[PDB]
Amino acid sequence: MKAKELREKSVEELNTELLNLLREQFNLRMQAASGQLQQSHLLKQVRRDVARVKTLLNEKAGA
Amino acid sequence: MIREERLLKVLRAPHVSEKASTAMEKSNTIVLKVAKDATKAEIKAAVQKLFEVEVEVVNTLVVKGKVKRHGQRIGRRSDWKKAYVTLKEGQNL
Amino acid sequence: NNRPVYIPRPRPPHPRL
Amino acid sequence: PSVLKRNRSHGFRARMATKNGRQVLARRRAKGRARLTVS
RNA sequence: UAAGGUGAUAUGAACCGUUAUAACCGGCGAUUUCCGAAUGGGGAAACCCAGUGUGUUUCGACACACUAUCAUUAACUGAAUCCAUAGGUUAAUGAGGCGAACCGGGGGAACUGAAACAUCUAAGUACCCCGAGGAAAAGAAAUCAACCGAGAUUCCCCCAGUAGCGGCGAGCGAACGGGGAGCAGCCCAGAGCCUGAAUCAGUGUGUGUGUUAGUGGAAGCGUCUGGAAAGGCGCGCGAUACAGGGUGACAGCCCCGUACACAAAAAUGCACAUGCUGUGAGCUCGAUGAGUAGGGCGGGACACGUGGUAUCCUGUCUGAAUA
RNA sequence: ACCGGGAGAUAGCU
RNA sequence: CGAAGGUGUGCUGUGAGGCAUGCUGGAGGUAUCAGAAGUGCGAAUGCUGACAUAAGUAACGAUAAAGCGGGUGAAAAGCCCGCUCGCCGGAAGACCAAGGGUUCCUGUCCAACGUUAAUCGGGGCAGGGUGAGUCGACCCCUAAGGCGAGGCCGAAAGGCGUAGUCGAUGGGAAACAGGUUAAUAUUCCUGUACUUGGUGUUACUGCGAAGGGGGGACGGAGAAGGCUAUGUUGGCCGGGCGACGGUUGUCCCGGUUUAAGCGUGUAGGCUGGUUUUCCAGGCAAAUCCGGAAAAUCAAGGCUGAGGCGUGAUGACGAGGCACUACGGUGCUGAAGCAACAAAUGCCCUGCUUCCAGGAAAAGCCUCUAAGCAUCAGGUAACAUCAAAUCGUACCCCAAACCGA
């Protein structure tokens, strides 16, 4: 989904990063303790998504 | 002001133990494994922002790694910080 | 959850388990 | 002995302070030992 | 490039895609916690304490950028002593560390043999410190033997363990000349005629050759031993590829694949012609890098005792012209 | 005194 | 259809050796001819791995000492429960420092260890366990010591040193009663408390820093009294009438505890108090301190354990009442007062004597130049908060540190 975040503006990228970190990071981390998180690829997917988001905002803005 | 991103990147996960289960109702206290530093102010602000609960004081401790020697060379476990959070009246997961 | 740890094959004089 | 005096006499910083400490550390690094001075 | 993949110990669920957003490789980029030259201060290496400039829907502290040292340059201020300088502030230039040896330097032993021994090989070696560059160092003549001689230096072959020296005792090591890789000479010190015309550096253009991932790439079956054939036997073919490696025993024709022909969106080394920017065509006649050459006093050193001292730096005194 | 080197040292002898 | 190697036989030559083969071996060896040997081992107290006799030999580790009924377990003088005997008890007990680094608790196992044994353990595996404004570290200052910007002597070196710098085992502020789990309590829960700093409100309102004063901040030796912990006794409360002679009594068993703070400021110790003048004293400053002189009063001022009422219509509790995985959980829970002795603890850094004069700085009270003295700053009370970070398991004169 590289093109999805590539076109987004700085404010939209910040909002996406905020909502992702708030919801998905914990919804996978809290469930990762025990009794939940049947699918394990969600952690890797969210980590890659946040890494891609952080990769942006360094060249789109301030460069 | 503490950045919400920092608040979200200090709480690792709740710690499951029988002592924690007893404390859930004995004193309305919970145990959470948190980041290495996990300053009381930052973690308290994170808890208030996320769970919308009331906390007056949070205790902190560090658990030393346990040396493990099974078959191969000795091994150590990463040191982790545990926080006892006492909620005033609000009960939440 | 990660119950399986993949215990390795031990020595001839190993804990009987 | 005590850990304080041990570090002050043969610790990384203590040895590095003297001129010969740099040579000793370079020799150790060339040797490849995991621990340089202590701990 | 792609139909398999989430590197392994070391299995399992989990899913990701199948013809171009699975995954892998390479080029260009961003992030790059703490100690470590560690550079804001302290400090027991991976710890603590801080100071300024920016933005805070709780303005209780957070997040981003700087805060060590040498000499110099630019600019602004500024003592002795009016400008001038001593001193101060902002930005820049290189560096304090590591890396195994290679060069130039500053110091530097001990054991051992020579009748012990002055002295010497030992040994300017082991070892300590500074700079250095892919080479460094050194080197275009007041260079060498002197009566004939070459015209840069470096290294190799002998020349040559030869001449000589040494309580002629241990050992030490020459020169000239010849043959080889290689050759380039010079710069300005200074006036005119003539100009950005040769050469050099930078900046872009397009070509070739390579690198940083890669593509294609020839030809085989039967029987017996046979655990399985790649082994004996029937025979055919490829070969610009019978180097090598893997496949249930020894494989050219099972595979990777070697010969050979191709491949670059982007960067990168070298060779080209050129727009542009700077050092700067070519000719003439001068001219000789000055307190210098030389000499004297006093240091260390050619086996040796400043000595009859040719010579190496001078602590110090004298002291010519430039063919 | 220990470490690494001079030094796989040195004369006689086992 | 069986290579090298291993292992036996037979045939061979004067010999180092050569050939065939049974079995194992299950994949390489190599005719003849020439070259290189890290080339042929039987000892150098030669070096590395394994295996021996000495040998079932002393010892099984202070000569404090174990035994029985029941339970787990197949196996119990070594484990678990109950009973009896014994040892230490100014320790062989308990709490901290250095040191060790999870050895601490639970569940589970017997690969290896415990001088033989385990089902057990300071052993393996899995889980849990350490909660701090009041404990300490941390941080401010600091002694010896180091570094030691500038800077002096000094050919280079070397010697020395202004300021700063760290450097604690030294000085600087604060919490206890009861409970809590198998492992954590000055931390968690009820209470009452206290310290440092910021903001606002109310009321009053002379501060700064350097400059000073007391204090911080101190040595050795010697003796007296009171108080407290603690213990004995008396009364009181609850439970009892003795396996066998007596034992309703002048009888036996258990309890009769409560912290810090708050006001009282006593016993004791120290100082004699009030007013006025100067200081050439504190680098010129002082409204504070001390020194030098006058008038007045007698018992004023400082320090000071312990006891007293609150803290505490509490907790703690002897001993009972219900549910129980028999391990335990909840409720109630009577009395809780006097006399004596007394310490190394406190009054007490108190009192007498002495030479060897027994550190310094910071925080803290004092009034102090300019100025503000409506303001700002300072003081009394209330509300709001912040006090970060680091160890809080366990052993710690010992089975866990140092000696293998």
Short mmCIF file of N, CA, C and O (backbone and C1' of nucleotides) in Angstrom, two decimals, chain G residues 72-98:
data_model
loop_
_atom_site.label_atom_id
_atom_site.label_comp_id
_atom_site.label_asym_id
_atom_site.label_seq_id
_atom_site.Cartn_x
_atom_site.Cartn_y
_atom_site.Cartn_z
P U G 72 0.00 -43.22 51.74
"O5'" U G 72 1.01 -42.18 51.09
"C5'" U G 72 0.54 -41.04 50.38
"C4'" U G 72 1.65 -40.36 49.62
"C3'" U G 72 2.48 -41.26 48.71
"O3'" U G 72 1.85 -41.49 47.47
"C1'" U G 72 3.92 -39.90 50.00
P G G 73 1.58 -43.00 46.97
"O5'" G G 73 3.02 -43.50 46.50
"C5'" G G 73 3.78 -42.76 45.56
"C4'" G G 73 5.26 -43.00 45.73
"C3'" G G 73 5.68 -44.46 45.84
"O3'" G G 73 5.75 -45.13 44.60
"C1'" G G 73 6.72 -43.22 47.55
P A G 74 4.87 -46.45 44.36
"O5'" A G 74 5.28 -47.40 45.57
"C5'" A G 74 4.82 -48.74 45.66
"C4'" A G 74 5.97 -49.69 45.91
"C3'" A G 74 7.03 -49.20 46.89
"O3'" A G 74 6.68 -49.46 48.23
"C1'" A G 74 8.07 -49.99 44.92
P A G 75 7.20 -48.49 49.40
"O5'" A G 75 8.77 -48.78 49.48
"C5'" A G 75 9.26 -50.09 49.73
"C4'" A G 75 10.72 -50.19 49.40
"C3'" A G 75 11.62 -49.15 50.04
"O3'" A G 75 11.97 -49.46 51.38
"C1'" A G 75 12.12 -49.31 47.74
P A G 76 11.23 -48.72 52.60
"O5'" A G 76 11.83 -47.25 52.58
"C5'" A G 76 13.22 -47.03 52.77
"C4'" A G 76 13.48 -46.08 53.92
"C3'" A G 76 12.65 -46.34 55.17
"O3'" A G 76 13.41 -46.05 56.34
"C1'" A G 76 12.20 -44.17 54.36
P A G 77 14.05 -47.24 57.21
"O5'" A G 77 15.37 -46.59 57.82
"C5'" A G 77 15.95 -47.10 59.02
"C4'" A G 77 16.25 -45.98 59.98
"C3'" A G 77 16.23 -44.58 59.39
"O3'" A G 77 14.93 -44.04 59.29
"C1'" A G 77 18.19 -44.86 60.68
P G G 78 14.49 -43.23 57.97
"O5'" G G 78 15.33 -41.88 58.05
"C5'" G G 78 15.28 -40.92 57.00
"C4'" G G 78 16.27 -39.81 57.21
"C3'" G G 78 16.31 -38.75 56.11
"O3'" G G 78 16.59 -37.47 56.67
"C1'" G G 78 18.43 -39.79 56.29
P C G 79 15.39 -36.44 56.94
"O5'" C G 79 14.43 -36.62 55.68
"C5'" C G 79 14.66 -35.90 54.48
"C4'" C G 79 13.38 -35.70 53.70
"C3'" C G 79 12.16 -35.28 54.51
"O3'" C G 79 12.14 -33.89 54.80
"C1'" C G 79 11.56 -37.04 53.06
P C G 80 11.49 -33.36 56.18
"O5'" C G 80 9.93 -33.62 55.99
"C5'" C G 80 9.14 -32.76 55.19
"C4'" C G 80 7.67 -33.09 55.31
"C3'" C G 80 7.11 -33.14 56.72
"O3'" C G 80 6.79 -31.86 57.24
"C1'" C G 80 6.42 -35.06 55.55
P C G 81 6.79 -31.62 58.83
"O5'" C G 81 5.53 -32.45 59.35
"C5'" C G 81 4.21 -31.96 59.16
"C4'" C G 81 3.19 -32.83 59.85
"C3'" C G 81 3.35 -32.99 61.35
"O3'" C G 81 2.83 -31.91 62.09
"C1'" C G 81 2.99 -35.11 60.37
P G G 82 3.39 -31.59 63.56
"O5'" G G 82 3.02 -32.89 64.41
"C5'" G G 82 1.72 -33.04 64.97
"C4'" G G 82 1.63 -34.29 65.81
"C3'" G G 82 2.60 -34.38 66.98
"O3'" G G 82 2.16 -33.65 68.11
"C1'" G G 82 2.61 -36.42 65.79
P C G 83 3.21 -33.15 69.22
"O5'" C G 83 3.73 -34.50 69.89
"C5'" C G 83 2.90 -35.23 70.78
"C4'" C G 83 3.59 -36.47 71.30
"C3'" C G 83 4.91 -36.24 72.01
"O3'" C G 83 4.75 -35.82 73.36
"C1'" C G 83 5.15 -38.01 70.47
P U G 84 5.90 -34.95 74.07
"O5'" U G 84 7.07 -35.99 74.33
"C5'" U G 84 6.87 -37.11 75.19
"C4'" U G 84 8.05 -38.04 75.19
"C3'" U G 84 9.41 -37.40 75.46
"O3'" U G 84 9.64 -37.14 76.83
"C1'" U G 84 9.58 -38.86 73.62
P C G 85 10.63 -35.96 77.27
"O5'" C G 85 12.06 -36.45 76.78
"C5'" C G 85 12.74 -37.50 77.45
"C4'" C G 85 14.12 -37.73 76.89
"C3'" C G 85 15.02 -36.50 76.81
"O3'" C G 85 15.62 -36.16 78.05
"C1'" C G 85 15.14 -37.70 74.78
P G G 86 16.12 -34.66 78.32
"O5'" G G 86 17.34 -34.47 77.31
"C5'" G G 86 18.54 -35.21 77.47
"C4'" G G 86 19.51 -34.95 76.35
"C3'" G G 86 19.94 -33.50 76.16
"O3'" G G 86 20.96 -33.11 77.07
"C1'" G G 86 19.39 -34.44 74.06
P C G 87 21.34 -31.56 77.25
"O5'" C G 87 21.93 -31.14 75.83
"C5'" C G 87 23.26 -31.48 75.46
"C4'" C G 87 23.73 -30.65 74.29
"C3'" C G 87 23.64 -29.15 74.47
"O3'" C G 87 24.72 -28.62 75.21
"C1'" C G 87 22.73 -29.74 72.38
P C G 88 24.54 -27.28 76.08
"O5'" C G 88 24.50 -26.13 74.99
"C5'" C G 88 25.61 -25.91 74.12
"C4'" C G 88 25.28 -24.91 73.05
"C3'" C G 88 24.76 -23.56 73.53
"O3'" C G 88 25.79 -22.69 73.98
"C1'" C G 88 23.40 -24.34 71.77
P G G 89 25.59 -21.87 75.34
"O5'" G G 89 24.27 -21.01 75.09
"C5'" G G 89 24.20 -20.12 73.99
"C4'" G G 89 22.78 -19.68 73.72
"C3'" G G 89 22.04 -19.05 74.89
"O3'" G G 89 22.39 -17.70 75.10
"C1'" G G 89 20.64 -20.64 73.84
P G G 90 23.56 -17.32 76.14
"O5'" G G 90 24.58 -16.46 75.27
"C5'" G G 90 24.55 -15.04 75.31
"C4'" G G 90 25.72 -14.43 74.57
"C3'" G G 90 27.09 -14.75 75.16
"O3'" G G 90 28.07 -14.80 74.11
"C1'" G G 90 26.71 -12.42 75.27
P A G 91 28.82 -16.17 73.76
"O5'" A G 91 28.25 -16.57 72.33
"C5'" A G 91 26.88 -16.94 72.17
"C4'" A G 91 26.73 -18.26 71.45
"C3'" A G 91 26.94 -18.21 69.94
"O3'" A G 91 27.52 -19.43 69.50
"C1'" A G 91 24.74 -18.94 70.40
P A G 92 28.10 -19.57 68.00
"O5'" A G 92 27.21 -20.72 67.36
"C5'" A G 92 27.14 -20.89 65.94
"C4'" A G 92 25.96 -21.74 65.55
"C3'" A G 92 24.62 -21.29 66.13
"O3'" A G 92 23.57 -21.58 65.20
"C1'" A G 92 25.11 -23.48 66.88
P G G 93 22.86 -20.39 64.39
"O5'" G G 93 21.74 -19.85 65.39
"C5'" G G 93 20.49 -20.51 65.52
"C4'" G G 93 19.45 -19.62 66.15
"C3'" G G 93 19.16 -18.32 65.41
"O3'" G G 93 18.27 -18.49 64.32
"C1'" G G 93 19.48 -17.86 67.70
P A G 94 18.52 -17.69 62.95
"O5'" A G 94 18.05 -16.20 63.28
"C5'" A G 94 16.70 -15.91 63.58
"C4'" A G 94 16.52 -14.48 64.04
"C3'" A G 94 17.04 -13.41 63.10
"O3'" A G 94 16.13 -13.11 62.05
"C1'" A G 94 17.78 -12.95 65.29
P C G 95 16.67 -12.48 60.67
"O5'" C G 95 17.14 -11.02 61.07
"C5'" C G 95 16.19 -9.98 61.29
"C4'" C G 95 16.87 -8.64 61.44
"C3'" C G 95 17.75 -8.20 60.28
"O3'" C G 95 17.01 -7.63 59.22
"C1'" C G 95 18.90 -7.86 62.32
P C G 96 17.66 -7.47 57.76
"O5'" C G 96 18.60 -6.19 57.90
"C5'" C G 96 19.62 -5.93 56.95
"C4'" C G 96 20.60 -4.90 57.44
"C3'" C G 96 21.92 -4.82 56.68
"O3'" C G 96 21.83 -4.05 55.49
"C1'" C G 96 22.37 -4.93 58.99
P A G 97 22.80 -4.38 54.25
"O5'" A G 97 24.26 -4.07 54.81
"C5'" A G 97 24.64 -2.74 55.15
"C4'" A G 97 26.13 -2.62 55.35
"C3'" A G 97 27.00 -3.26 54.28
"O3'" A G 97 27.13 -2.46 53.12
"C1'" A G 97 27.81 -3.86 56.42
P A G 98 27.02 -3.14 51.66
"O5'" A G 98 28.44 -3.83 51.45
"C5'" A G 98 29.62 -3.05 51.41
"C4'" A G 98 30.86 -3.90 51.59
"C3'" A G 98 31.07 -5.00 50.57
"O3'" A G 98 31.63 -4.54 49.35
"C1'" A G 98 31.40 -5.87 52.74
#
